[PDB]
TrEMBL record, chain A:
Top-level taxon of the source organism: Viruses
Whole sequence portion shown: 213 to 443 of 1019
Protein name: TmpF
UniProtKB/TrEMBL annotation, chains B, C:
Organism: Staphylococcus phage 812
Protein name per its UniProtKB record: Baseplate protein
Family matches, as Pfam families: BW3TFN
InterPro entries per the UniProt record, alphabetical: BW3TFN
Length: 192, 176, 176
């Protein structure tokens, strides 16, 4: 029963806060189109660690940019576990009780001089407190690093639609843009 | 229309009748992407990744679940904390034996030393001219036959002080 | 100023008399500098590095190398790909049985799952008050007793199905 949830991705300098009934694509609508969906290559190539890194241009006017990811546990559970009753008001509890502890693995590098680094935060949206929770803080350089973390039980990170929202907060500092190379992104769970 | 439990007994007997052609095989000598969490197998494949070699199946038999007192005079198979009893082909319908137990053992460098991860079974294998030994590296095989069954375990490593006693209990219909 | 041939056998009888208190122990759970080339085991060391835990000895006995025709027709052991005979304490000097055999099996998760690189045997282990189970993690042990024998190994691994079995034959004076 061990498994991974791999790659909606959206790049923007605007802050999005999902609601309890927020769907996958509401990020683009909430930003008035002041951002872009990640390229097809991001969905194709970030599902395993190899030499094929996906480069993403993080434009910013404020010195901060965001890469949002949305993971739909309803469609995942319907595909891999159609026997689970996802129509109940308890579906978030059922899915979280089923997954138990979730870990995020996220391998990335920055297209910057090898002697420089930028601050990056991995965040998950907590619907119990209606805020972005920082689960990892790292300095990202030219060298690839996993910035992933174990986030534990996902019940409070799931909305009514069983969507989980994650983001990278990327502090470009005084730069108008920073390019990020993404090698691997995986939401991995292990239960008995 | 329907088939029967007795058909699964007869197809188990067929697989057991092939035993002279049956070898355990092991493979995947290089790492997984992470050794703790292997990738899923492929039931349409007919050979292992990174094939280390073949060893003749030391024991091919029918089984059923064990019970006492009526299996006390018999011999029992233990695996995965489960405990099972052996059945001979001419008794298979009377005992109801539709489960096959497959076992082989390797010790030392009689197949190449290193780590192993993929485990499985082949039948209708043919060895090359001038060779008759029960341990084969792939260079010694004329035809690999059909790879029937395989799995993607977490690894282990080998020497003369270790026994590669891998086994399956398999069934041709798990959900009648 | 010599020892007699009996003298080594008496120390071996002593080691076999301790058997109830004897436990397998396992350790060095993180990498060496090279997993294929371990460093030398230091005879001054009191206990394994990175201790995983302890399991009671399943078989302890005096043993000797086999001789034909007589031992071929007795109770028998195969190890080192070669043949050995078991000896009882009340015959030890007549047989010359100066080798002690030690053996235990660690099954599934009865100790925590992980890789290992050291194997050895302890006597005089005492568990904390009220514990009686044959498998112990370090926090369940009141006195670790004494590590008599161990060796460094190339890296090895375990999973929930598997049994890791380790066994030694040893002698008290390799250097007369």
């Amino acid at each position: 029963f061990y498994g991974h949830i791999n790659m909606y991705g959206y790049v923007t300098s605007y802050v999005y806060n999902p609601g309890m009934t927020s769907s996958v694509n509401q990020i683009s609508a909430s930003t008035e189109g002041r951002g872009q969906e990640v390229p097809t290559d991001y969905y194709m190539y970030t599902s395993t660690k190899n030499n094929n890194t996906v480069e993403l241009s993080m434009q910013t006017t404020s010195g901060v940019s965001y890469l949002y990811n949305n993971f739909n546990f309803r469609d995942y559970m319907s595909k891999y576990r159609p026997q689970v009753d996802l129509q109940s008001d308890e579906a978030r509890r059922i899915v979280s009780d089923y997954i138990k502890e979730l870990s995020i693995d996220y391998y990335l590098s920055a297209v910057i001089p090898p002697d420089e680094s930028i601050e990056i935060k991995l965040q998950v949206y907590d619907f119990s407190i209606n805020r972005w929770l920082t689960v990892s803080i790292n300095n990202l350089s030219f060298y690839e690093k996993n910035i992933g973390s174990n986030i534990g039980y996902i019940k409070d990170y799931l909305n009514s639609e069983l969507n989980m929202f994650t983001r990278l907060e990327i502090n470009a500092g005084k730069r108008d843009s920073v390019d990020i190379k993404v090698n691997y992104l995986d939401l991995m769970f292990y239960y008995y | 229309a329907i088939a029967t439990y007795n058909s699964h007994v007869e197809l188990a007997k067929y697989l057991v009748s092939k035993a002279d052609s049956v070898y355990l095989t092991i493979g995947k000598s290089t790492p997984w992407s992470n050794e703790t969490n292997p990738p899923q197998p492929d039931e349409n494949a007919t050979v292992l990744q990174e094939v280390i070699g073949y060893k003749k199946a030391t024991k091919v038999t029918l089984v059923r679940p064990s019970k006492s007192p009526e299996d006390d005079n018999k011999n029992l198979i233990s695996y995965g904390n489960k405990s099972w009893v052996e059945v001979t082909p001419e008794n298979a319908k009377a005992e109801g034996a539709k489960w096959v137990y497959l076992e082989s053992s390797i010790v030392g460098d009689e197949l190449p030393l290193g780590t192993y991860r993929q485990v499985g079974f082949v039948m209708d294998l043919v060895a090359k001219s001038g060779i008759s030994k029960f341990n084969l590296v792939p260079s010694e095989v004329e035809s690999t036959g059909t790879l029937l069954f395989f799995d993607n375990k977490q690894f282990q490593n080998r020497s003369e002080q270790t026994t590669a006693k891998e086994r399956f209990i398999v069934e041709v219909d798990p959900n009648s």
